[model samples]
Target chain A: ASVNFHLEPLRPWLDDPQITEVCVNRPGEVFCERASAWEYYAVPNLDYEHLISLGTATARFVDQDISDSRPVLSAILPMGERIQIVRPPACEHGTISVTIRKPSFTRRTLEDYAQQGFFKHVRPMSKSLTPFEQELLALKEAGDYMSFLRRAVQLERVIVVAGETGSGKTTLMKALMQEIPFDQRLITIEDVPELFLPDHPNHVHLFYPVTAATLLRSCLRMKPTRILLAELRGGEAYDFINVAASGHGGSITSCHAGSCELTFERLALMVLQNRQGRQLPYEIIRRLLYLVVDVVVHVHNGVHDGTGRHISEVWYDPNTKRAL
Target chain B: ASVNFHLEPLRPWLDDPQITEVCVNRPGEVFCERASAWEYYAVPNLDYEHLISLGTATARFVDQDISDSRPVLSAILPMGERIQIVRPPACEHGTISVTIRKPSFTRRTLEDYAQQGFFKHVRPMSKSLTPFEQELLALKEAGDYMSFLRRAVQLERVIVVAGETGSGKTTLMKALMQEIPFDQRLITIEDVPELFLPDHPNHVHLFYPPVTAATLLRSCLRMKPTRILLAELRGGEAYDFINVAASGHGGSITSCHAGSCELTFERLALMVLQNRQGRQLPYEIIRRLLYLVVDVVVHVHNGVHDGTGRHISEVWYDPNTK
Candidate 1:
């Protein structure tokens, strides 16, 4: 039913929707990843001529050029997957290497997150030594925390989703974003396009190079009902917190941190980077942060002894010093 | 005089000791890293035949074989550098890609760490808002912490060097490790051999799979190591590590992924489950073991002034306090 191409060796894997990543290391090696695990693709070896031909054709198919002068090629393929290639001389190796990355498949909504019991589980404060263990387990299955998230959104409370790389921060942020009222005008800023905002009808997405601080300042004039930052790094955190403090309520953002507490610490550190001379006092930083942020949704991998991402804790910080 | 071979394209970068890594993506593209940054090397473009010939010669130079049948090759070159190669059909790109990695360069000693003011600076509690700022800056120039480190090693205390990736944990670990007296026997374990300990005459380096933490600790109990150093904390070795600190050894050290003191506790508890007993230890017991066995936890961070690697951000849980 689909139009076929002469890139025969990679064709089978590329056609398989299950395959998320396709990589060519050299002449004899090809690998693809499915379900977070990579396995070699048993394909006929494309000698130098054939491999070069395939790379050249693929580059042409993407409407890009590959040559001695321009040995690199990057483009979005027809199937919306991002394709990148590095050829000989440019690669310093005699062969060409091609990598095609599938776009994010995070179409999972807030309802799915709740059904997955992401919000319901009670975070274990101490070891499960008694009947309370069953209570925690019950909370795990019937995650009623979505109601709190809905309340937080309704009350225009700013939320921060915190986690390490691949710890479902972006996933949770995108799902929580759907909770925002569709009629409310929303403004989102990111370094790279990750957030899929299909539900939010009145939203403007901004990309960076135009620094987030610049965009955050500009976003205020745009009559945004709420602001959403895909993630905050460097001086942008300072600007974001400043915006949050200036009555720009209901702003949602994410940060890279080891835990929920570390998220605040990391944000404070980022804000301190903008300070000159004697750094801002931690108490002042905490007070300023408290004025803005209302909740920290901590996400982690391998929750409940299961190998999957889950929300471990939802911290409410009415007074930033007393986060619980 | 050194024995040389005919792998012409790679000879220059591979011979330059300053170049830590040499990688070939394709016949024409070669790159090497000097510091932490990568730069393309100006080299001759070996066409298909020439690239294949060079790959074959490199494999033979290292006394390894490569072909369609056995497409992958990994070996240590005569000069002690590690080299790996993958041939065409196996690589699927119609060209052979070669990667040559130099051994970990941890020649940066404790003296170097002190000179760089790693041990001198006090982690700011609030901010440098008062006379404490001058006191902290004064301590930076005169690093009195090295004396404490010396005493810690003298006391045979177990030290854990913790930090995130690229936070210079390994470098700090190696520097602190040198505080151990040369007379004391040191036994080290790692999955991939990175630590270069040429100074220690009485050190046995053990590799895993052949020698696991459980098996290695059991053997070390008999081998008589004055101190046991596990290069990293992962897998079943954590239980064995706790045992080594408690019973088999006086000195112990390792590195793990943790930002704060509590995360280390969480990581250790998880790692302890890999114990062969299949019985999970209570968190409080594990926490107590950590408190008792660990004398110091040195946390490092990428310096703020410049990206010149790590400085000691925190030194928590000093045994002297308790």
Candidate 2:
């Protein structure tokens, strides 16, 4: 029923709602992929010009308006996909080629992380041999230990997991939340939604899955009992310290650093961004997290024995905020 | 005369290159160092229209024959520089905004890196607690150990240096070249031109120095040498390794990730791109790198007392090629 000039050939599939991405290989090769699978066909009536016009129109629809524009030999989008819009100098056939990646079909979940190797290095993020998943469950069961943890949770105002990637910085972050009382509000901001929290009554997981800059701004409004951030990378880290220092209580996050001391050093650098003279004294940050960093959970990737990712070490400071 | 437009009047810096990356927003904006000051008045002739028109020309330079073009908004060039161009919005005297970053700059040298307090806590590369300048002189005297090092170099293939950032990885790489003999054909490839061999008559340091990948690739064919050196870690490790292994004549050398064992693993993994399926048996890498690998790992850290970066430790493998 579509009245477009190009509708005559694809009239049968025109009404199909399942088609998500269309591919046009310059000149006259037309293809479409639905749900991220390719389907190819040759149309009888649509000529090379028709395909080129359609490709050009599609490019324009994507805000790539080249009208009043010189038709180049090729066009490339920012994502590294290219569209050839000219004839082969050494060959025949003037044609237009379009390439577009289909958006993900299924809605994503943290489970998708495990499906990928995001949790591939899980063995390294545990207390001893137990993974973070088991450590949380064990920590929950130890009545006396749980009481001590509860006391530490009450006393400490800042928490950090300092380690390299695949060390369960994220997975431990997900497991640590299981310790929080269901009545307390929890807000987590991550560049990707990779955490599966308790889904408790008071838990509010603000999944901020965007680029670095967007994740930092997301933290400004995600007020709650505990603020679980994915990791600190950019210049917004000092803002996090300020939010935590203002009695936000239990401002917990992971960082892509080796030790607690480096974490503080990184914090000072980012804090310098928001401070006067583009500078902040290192001691000021140490003061903000004065013993607020109660413990450190570290992990190391061990030699692979079998299928399991192993945890090599975990260190907890006897006193709070130990730089080493 | 070339057209010059004031960047501030039209737009924010937009995370692009600065004329000079001074610590801006101080008493006033300065270039390079705070001492060199510059103040400019807006020469109103170079306005939004000129920017938009330039941007349009830039776009048309890529695509030339369309009749349906609108006001150019934003475009990212092939080299990954992001710029926004558009007809100035309403309320302003219609002038477009254009922002572009210049070429990315090089990392600081060993001397500048030393000045940043990175070597304060760590052990100095030499027993002398002076700057990298002092360390260079000590390395000149390093010939006393050359007979032992030459034997070790003859045995090992892979050399790894494990240390933290600012640990003098660059300094150690340059220091060891003293053992490389003058008669031997030595070719060094670095992303920057830092390792200079002034006295060595036969030494050739092939400085890549932020050149194009295609050009660097071509340089591999022309430079026939008995010794090859790579200055830094790169994703192109696979391509470089292919050239080295296939030719099998040169001593391939490189400095990589600060953490010693871990850095070797990273290079081996990147080199996997040369494999048929991008997955090679780990043992193959661990083996081929037997002699050419790191014979010493020097670590620099902030001294425990003052929190200044210093050289603190050195790990040497007793094996033939450690």
Candidate 3:
């Protein structure tokens, strides 16, 4: 209660029950996520040192320490709000960003979202192209998939990049993760730190001191805003699905498969290699995979394109159970 | 000469040049295999402690031990013969089994055996029945398989025989090769030299250690052989072997260590599933591929009725009326 006066600049957006998350990207500016959309407004005139002292107070509240050696903090506040803080050397000069995730006081149903056109951009399923067909076309002719994918990442949709070897899926995945907002804390699991998310500075790139699945379980306790797994090669695919199906969205991963449809089957095969996944039926495991994965981007070699690395198709499944 | 005195009780069968393998199931009795046939005979009187001491000497010859923790011994003694010994708890309570396999001394080629009319039993192409008439009766007549199998071989049906270790699948395979016509050019592929074709004058026996069986299998296609005899299918080589069968190369024979007829096809499909494009094909689809390529499956078991330790339990036809 003594440090309650420090977050006074954040109190207006924090007090608003409709806001899902209150973010401070700078001293006097605040961003709020309302119903899966971001909006910005001005806050009280608090200098840069005031925000650092506020972060120091948050670290002290959690009985932790933050300095130049370790400039990131993730802990739950006394009021049940999840807070993440990032400072200099991890971010820009004299700049810090803090994000507070709050529980929604109000709830809505399917009809409530249907009346608001929440899924207006959804399209019907398509299986017209062959698995190997990659004719050269402009981004516009390919249905502006680059634009759609950025919006999907912005909205925190779960994605899985599918390709065979040398399909450039890794490079494409790094480019997509660049669209994640600066306020969201990302936790990337990989064998090597290939994904350099320089823009998304409030991030945790774990190299799996423990294995990927065990590290993923620890990520849940870390209160991650996003979990970006570099690749799903084994039983860790099951744990990644658990994190996604448990309402932690904005997770992105890659796998080896020939086509978009084969990606789900490959994931099911990988899932059955784990102890938890072996108990479930194969049909039920596949249904859970299809419902959790939002989009599949099959990248392959193009005959006409010079680079030969092309995203062949962006197949999205609107896993809505409502009659509408 | 020094170790020969230690095995004095086993010297009679060990000295017999015609015997390929000598086995002692218990005290006072023994079995010997000669010319792909097993014959039981009586040995010199030996007590249980004497046999156990002999096993201990054999184990010490290879610098190993056989005890309750390690009850089995597999080694080669001073005579350059492979020996296997099993004690109690692995076998019966008071019995032990010892097997000794020796290399043959006499060297004979194909033409030398042809002079003796060794292939006089090999049948000709199926002249007894036509296709539609035989297809109706081949399933109706349920009986012994010597005649039916000889007919199946002469009609140029692709066969895959499955067996376990010590099941004599090789001996059964040698009998099957005896049915192939002498004029047909046979190409045998294996890692070890086992199938000595004494009847077929025009044949090539290929062994592989420097090159894999997959490479040799593809090389067989270029040589224009009549049939490809892969001694076994274990891995990605099953892809080329299956293609050879699917592309209308009949009379081809191969073997796998799969336990049963159904598992034989599944094992072949799983081996093919290890490749790149082959991995894309699902389990059931590759099973259908095996069904289309393979015509017959003969599953052999061990120690049934016959003292030869080899028995045919199941003969399945994929496209036949069952």
What lDDT is reached at residue A103 by model 1? Answer: 48
Query: Candidate 1: DockQ?
Result: 0.01
Candidate with the larger lDDT of 1 and 3: 3
What local lDDT does model 3 show for residue B247? 70
| lDDT tens digits, residue span A64-153, model 2 | 543323333233333222333322221123543333332222322223322543222212211232232234335545634434444445
Report fnat for all candidates as fractions from 0 to 1.
Answer: 0.00, 0.00, 0.00
Q: Can you rank all candidates by lDDT, best first?
A: 3, 1, 2
Tell me which of candidates 1 and 3 scores higher on TM-score. Answer: 1
Instruction: Please write out the lDDT profile of model 3 over residues A1-324, one tens digit for every residue.
Output: 534677777788888877767777667777776644467677658778988988888878855887766566776666657777766645444766677777423323223433544223221223332111222123324687877788667756688999988888898888888888776667777776688777764555665534788767656544456888889988988777766654467788899888898898899999888765664568756766775687788998766667677777777745231111
- TM-scores, all models, native as reference: 0.36, 0.31, 0.34
Worst lDDT run of 10 residues, candidate 1 chain A, spans A118-127
- Tens digits of per-residue lDDT, candidate 1, B1-322, equal 1123334566778778788877664566666766644566555665656667666776676677667665556666666767666555443245555667787756888999999999887756554334532443243334444444555566666778776433446666676677777655566765444454656644556544223556656545544456888877755677777877788477687887554344455455445655654135654566567777776776655432233233554555433322
Query: How well does candidate 3 match the true structure in TM-score terms?
Result: 0.34
Show where candidate 2 strays beyond 4 Å: A1-324, B1-162, B203-222, B242-247, B250-252, B270-309, B316-322
Alpha-carbon runs more than 4 Å astray in model 1 = A1-324, B1-143, B209-211, B304-309, B320-322
